[PDB]
Amino acid sequence: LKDKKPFANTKKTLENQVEELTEKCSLKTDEFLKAKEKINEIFEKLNTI
């Protein structure tokens, strides 16, 4: 019974790390969208030139 509680604490920590996964995925998707839009815009500028 005493040992059970640290398992719950580790569960809370790992759910926080899952939230960190969500945030990291969001920022990675943002970077992907930005870089893809930038290279597409450069390609479009090259086409216009």
């Binding site: 398992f7 920590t13 090259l46």
Partner: protein, 51 residues
């Protein structure tokens, strides 16, 4: 030790789902578009400069 956080654990089938899902994002279309762009730029430059 101390805080019960093991360094690593064996893979699980549920974790195997995500492991199979993980892949390296591709640049094949980007690379081929870049290659075609530079090739057409070279072709244009071939006759672009004044004789």
């Amino acid at each position: 030790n101390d805080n019960p956080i093991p360094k690593s654990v064996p893979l699980h089938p549920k974790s195997g789902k995500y492991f199979h899902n993980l892949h390296a994002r591709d640049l094949s279309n980007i690379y081929q578009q870049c290659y075609k762009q530079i090739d057409e730029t070279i072709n244009q430059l071939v006759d672009s400069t004044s004789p």
